[PDB]
Amino acid sequence: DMPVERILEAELAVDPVTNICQAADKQLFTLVEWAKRIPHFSELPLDDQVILLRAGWNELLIASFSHRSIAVKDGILLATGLHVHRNSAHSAGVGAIFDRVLTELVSKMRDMQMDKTELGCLRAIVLFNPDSKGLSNPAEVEALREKVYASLEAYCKHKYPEQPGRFAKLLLRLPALRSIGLKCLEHLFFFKLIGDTPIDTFLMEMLE
């Protein structure tokens, strides 16, 4: 129904502010292909697929670059292969949120060795966000979310039975992800306001 193997397959299948904006734009195209590979997403009404991706893209990308950065020392590995370290983050004005990414997401993913199936399932939970405004039938989206976390729980309890609290521990990174996403979006809106975003991009559409 919502097999974690399919969610894993979807994961495996896919100036510092210029670098940040170019990386986010690159990954937006990839994110659409990722979402189509999540079971039942493409069966939602098209206008609801649009709503979910507009509501969730930023958290979905942040989760992915955070997990990608586990092997980086005190930094973020952007999808372009460029790193953001502390000096660049401060030059971009994003030093405080950079620190939160490292302490609340990257380091916690690293400490618990969050795996790619778990990451993919948390991202599918964020994708299937039933609070997204304007959905034709929010409960259908909640139903898909509940299928994801039922599958995630069964996966964690089979693979990590000596860690009974692991499923809840994964879900309890999502408030941090929500906060962090709101602040990153604030920064991106500011980069757009002052004209530091590349123009004519998919990122600009997401910010409009």
Binding site: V32, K36, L46, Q49, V50, L53, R54, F202, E205, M206
Partner: peptide, 11 residues
């Protein structure tokens, strides 16, 4: 939202 709505239909 022309880019996203097109990419969702592009196979």
């Amino acid at each position: 939202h022309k880019i996203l709505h097109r990419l969702l239909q592009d196979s």
